Write a protein that binds this ligand. Structure first.
Ligand code: SF4
Ligand code: ZN
Lengths: 754, 138
């Protein structure tokens, strides 16, 4: 299609369009005109990516100013979905117009999946794979390689052929999807990691996980050339406020404290051994500290940086000498004085949430170490370690967390919280204290990204209401509007099973345990679906531990064989590797004749990134209300902070947040308007939260569907499937919800110009 | 800790660690109340810490429990430096760089004292502390 929004061609890759899309198209350009925030709700059943990319890509190719576009998704899995979608649209944009791209657009996932060196790629741990190639292709290791001819230092050689051919230009013209990128890079024996690392200043659009925008330790290479005058795009960003606070979160364990002593004592050996050999550089680095923060070679580091910037990207940084901490022996001494004080603060017999100030003052009372120099731990460690040119990190892995933490808490106050549990309640009565620490307001990290740009886009099919987030992140949008699914057919049956076959108000809030009155009713309720439902059916527990709780007794119950006698059952596994193998086989079985049934957690990772088409998404299950206070009052602590900071209480936020995570899972049942699937839910309180739903979801929910019985619901979904299974192809009223190819959008919307 | 707590109650980590496994300021090892109370009651006697011979002094002990005695001794050396430099002229004129330089010297005195790898300034630091004490006394 090629229509206009009164200013720009719209090279829409599909012949068909949708009424939401043009309304989506109407607002995106309108928002694009006035760079703001404009939080909008677009139904996930429609593919917003097409409406997303098409108007934006044209906008850059029509308006000649915004040469850089930024999209931040939740998962790199979404990135490759966007990567091919852009690639297809880029092909289509060329297809409709010829060759008018000259465009650079690539994803960004990690070094782990982009380090093409097989040995480094073979390693499992993401830290090591990063660290290995960091060491394998290091600014100093290559010196140990180039200056001293030796086999001691090897290289990825992908970074080298990067420096040979790749660091003169870009990859020729492709908008490389991850498969296409990896296929190309491997044939060029290239490193897509270092490629995008240097391609930061070259990609006309960049797609990556929110963390590269959010996580300052990886949101630190930010170049204002691609950032300042760019547009920021967010979808499904509702479950990111937690991520933001998670990005500032930090859990500690006395074992790691001993690991810290393991590293910190090893530092004493490391600094002493080089001191006998070459302390002159260390003395020279003291002068490099005497001149300042040694930004000459603590930032100008091709592959040198040991400690990254865990704090926000150098906003709250001082650069003077650290007084006496200039000496490494002194530097470790306060650190060694600290870790034991930390241990002395870790050994608390009960749970204590210590204020950042009082705890710091308490430290000062115990170990008189000043706050401002304490932030220098991160820079000093990154500085010192490379000067030590250590050959290992595992002993020092605990240390960078301290360099993270000690800088963090010394930088952060009255927006963060240090809390020292004496153990974990799930394994209480044993000594396992955690010195848990995190932020409280998510907007704190959002404020710099708020500050840096005006044109920012946020979208979700789940966000409801669209007002908590402006309250939460303390910002003003332009358009706070929700889109409804223009469907002339049901295509999904929202079902609230408050009452079971027993007509019992059934819930997950009662306990995190089993009661067969509710549970066996649930088990009996579930099995009838296995017979009637086709391949594709998933459950979402409120908690993984709660998930396992119900599993064993149902396994003990005879309920287990019949569903196997009906379909295939695949579990959620703590390792995603087995889970992935389950997932593909589940989809394979879903693609296969033998039916497949799944089971997950509403907080599980599947609800985060994994979508399911018509066949793959057929019958979603919400196992009770997804609730999170199974854990401690750290939720309440932030919530109490939330309650005092914002006039939002627990349950209101909880219902908002729980249904947000509930709706987070439910968005994965749909692929397009061709897709469909009944949306069953089983909890007594589900009837109350009819308002908390997103509009189209709430619109799709009739009031007659509340507190339904499973038996009556079984009849309800019974007819739905056959009707949907029936080839409902009117081909005349479809154009009402299709806005027939290049005509109705041209005709109707231009008619609707009044 | 796990197995180094006492000549008597060696595995005292899980043995109800309620008795004071205190450290004599001149012995620097974990001595349980089953052992230390046998000692200081009669006076300055040595404890059999794996056959140790250092004297546990009279009723003049200190509290050190579960605070990394060696690092605590370094902290004590830092505290000794903090005690020696309790009235040290660092910000008497308010100069931060001078105080920054002065702080380095006191830490080096602690660093010389608390290291012991090639401690020779450590004895000089005590003399310097004595010189500081001479400055402090006078
Ligand atoms: S040089 Fe390239 S392929 Fe080799 S480990 Fe580093 S990033 Fe991976
Ligand atoms: Zn004993």
């Amino acid at each position: 299609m090629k229509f206009y929004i009164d200013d720009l061609p719209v090279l829409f890759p599909y012949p068909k369009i949708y009424p939401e899309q043009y309304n989506y198209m109407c607002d995106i350009k309108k928002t694009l005109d006035v760079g703001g925030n404009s939080i909008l709700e677009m139904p996930s059943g429609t593919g917003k990516t097409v409406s997303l990319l098409s108007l934006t890509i044209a906008y850059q190719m029509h308006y000649p100013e915004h040469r850089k576009i930024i999209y931040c998704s939740r998962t790199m899995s979404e990135i490759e979905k966007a990567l091919v979608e852009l690639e297809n649209l880029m092909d289509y944009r060329t297809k409709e117009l010829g060759y008018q791209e000259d465009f650079r657009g690539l994803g960004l996932t990690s070094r782990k999946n982009l380090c093409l060196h097989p040995e480094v790629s073979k390693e499992r741990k993401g830290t090591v794979v990063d660290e290995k190639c960091r060491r394998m292709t290091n600014g100093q290791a290559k010196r140990k390689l180039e200056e001293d001819p030796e086999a001691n230092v090897e290289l990825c050689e992908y970074h080298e052929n990067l420096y040979n051919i790749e660091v003169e230009d870009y990859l020729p013209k492709g908008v490389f999807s991850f498969e296409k990128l990896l296929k190309y890079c491997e044939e060029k024996t290239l490193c897509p990691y270092f490629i995008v690392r240097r391609m930061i200043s070259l990609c006309n659009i960049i797609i990556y996980s929110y963390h590269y925008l959010l996580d300052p330790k990886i949101a630190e290479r930010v170049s204002n050339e691609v950032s300042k005058d760019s547009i920021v795009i967010f979808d499904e960003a509702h479950n990111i406020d937690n991520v933001c606070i998670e990005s500032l979160s930090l859990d500690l364990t006395t074992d790691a404290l001993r690991r810290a002593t393991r590293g910190a004592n090893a530092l004493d050996e490391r600094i002493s051994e080089v001191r006998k050999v070459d302390s002159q550089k260390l003395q020279d680095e003291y002068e490099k500290l005497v001149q300042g923060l040694h930004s000459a070679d603590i930032l100008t580091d091709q592959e040198e940086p040991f400690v990254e910037t865990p704090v926000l990207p150098q906003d709250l940084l001082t650069e003077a000498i650290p007084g006496n901490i200039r000496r490494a022996e002194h530097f470790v001494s306060f650190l060694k004085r600290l870790i034991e004080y930390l241990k002395t603060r870790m050994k608390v017999l009960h749970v204590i949430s210590e204020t950042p100030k009082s705890f710091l003052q308490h430290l000062k009372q115990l170990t008189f170490i000043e706050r401002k120099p304490l932030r220098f731990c991160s820079e000093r460690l990154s500085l010192l370690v490379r000067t030590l040119e250590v050959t290992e990190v595992e002993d020092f892995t605990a240390l960078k967390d301290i360099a993270t933490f000690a800088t963090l808490i010394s930088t952060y106050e009255e927006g963060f919280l240090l809390i020292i549990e004496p153990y974990e309640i799930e394994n209480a009565a044993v000594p396992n204290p955690i010195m848990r620490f995190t932020c409280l307001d998510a907007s704190i990290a959002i404020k710099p990204v708020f500050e840096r740009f005006s044109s920012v886009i946020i979208t979700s099919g789940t966000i409801s209401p669209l007002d908590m987030y402006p309250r939460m992140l303390n910002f003003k949008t332009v358009l706070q509007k929700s889109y409804a699914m223009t469907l002339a057919k049901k295509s999904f049956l929202p079902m609230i099973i408050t009452k079971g076959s027993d007509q019992v108000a059934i819930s997950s809030r009662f306990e995190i345990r089993n009661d067969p009155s509710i549970v066996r009713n649930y088990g009996s309720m579930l099995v009838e679906f296995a017979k009637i439902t086709p391949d594709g059916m998933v459950v979402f527990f409120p908690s993984y531990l709660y998930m396992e709780s119900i599993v064993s007794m149902w396994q003990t119950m005879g309920i287990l064989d019949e569903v196997w006698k009906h379909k295939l059952i695949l579990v959620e596994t703590p390792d995603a590797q087995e889970t992935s193998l389950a997932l593909e086989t589940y989809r394979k079985a879903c693609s296969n004749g033998r039916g497949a049934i799944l089971l997950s957690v509403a907080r599980g990772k599947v609800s985060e990134g994994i979508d399911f088409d018509h066949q793959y998404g057929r019958t979603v299950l919400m196992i009770g209300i997804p609730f999170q206070y199974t854990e401690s009052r750290i939720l309440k602590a932030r919530l109490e902070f939330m309650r005092e900071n914002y006039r939002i209480r627990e349950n209101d936020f909880l219902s908002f947040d729980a249904m947000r995570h509930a709706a987070q899972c439910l968005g994965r049942v749909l692929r397009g308007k061709d897709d469909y699937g009944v949306m069953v839910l089983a909890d007594r309180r589900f009837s109350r939260k009819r308002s908390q739903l997103p509009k189209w979801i709430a619109q799709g929910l009739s009031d007659a569907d509340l507190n339904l019985s499973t038996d009556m619901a079984i009849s309800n979904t019974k007819q739905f499937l056959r009707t949907m299974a029936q080839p409902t192809d009117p081909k005349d009223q479809e154009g009402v919800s299709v806005w027939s190819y290049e005509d109705l959008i041209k005709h109707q919307n231009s008619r609707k110009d009044q | 800790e796990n197995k180094d707590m006492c000549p008597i109650c060696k595995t005292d980590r899980y043995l109800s660690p309620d008795v004071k496994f205190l450290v004599n300021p001149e012995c620097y090892h974990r001595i349980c109340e089953s052992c230390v109370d046998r000692i200081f009651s009669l006076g300055p006697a040595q404890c059999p810490y794996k056959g140790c011979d250092k004297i546990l002094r009279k009723n003049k002990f200190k509290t050190q429990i579960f605070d990394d005695v060696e690092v605590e001794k370094e902290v004590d050396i830092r505290k000794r430096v903090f005690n020696v430099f309790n009235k040290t002229i660092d910000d008497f004129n308010g100069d931060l760089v001078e105080y920054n330089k002065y702080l380095e010297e006191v830490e080096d005195i602690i660093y010389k004292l608390d290291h012991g790898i090639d401690v020779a300034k450590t004895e000089e630091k005590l003399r310097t502390y004595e010189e500081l004490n001479k400055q402090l006394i006078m």
